[PDB]
Write a protein that binds this ligand. Sequence first.
Ligand SMILES: Nc1n[nH]c2ccccc12
Length: 167
Amino acid sequence: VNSFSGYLKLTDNVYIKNADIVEEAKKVKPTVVVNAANVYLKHGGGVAGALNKATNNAMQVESDDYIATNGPLKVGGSCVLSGHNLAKHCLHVVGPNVNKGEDIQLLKSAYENFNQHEVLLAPLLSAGIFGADPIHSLRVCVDTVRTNVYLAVFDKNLYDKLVSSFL
Ligand SMILES: Nc1n[nH]c2ccccc12
């Protein structure tokens, strides 16, 4: 049993809810929240900007030190950093950004990072300002992630379309 409430069950291991991931993290304090990161961990907008704002910029400060030491992530890659006030850990995952011309086949590699964690609160990778089709992102998630994933989708219209169209 876990703390996650109000989710629709899509599969054995994937759950979905219309929710602001920031407000959900604040309520649950999950072991892992996933950030929709870029390779530079520059948390300007989208999910990353919202998560970072909720940490009062502490996520960005920590991320800048990580990049100064390690250099950029790979598209499809990830790193584990602090969850600050939102979670124990933040898994920063880089999905391909279609608005930069990145290979959508890297979306499966991105979701494979989730399998290193037994339970996660996450957004749909490569959705929103990363430009991919969220219906496709949900299909790759279900067909790739084997651990227990709680997906938070703030847009209500999109949430209803994802559920209604789910095979
Ligand atoms: N699914 C989401 N929860 N919170 C967000 C903030 C920005 C973009 C997407 C989300």
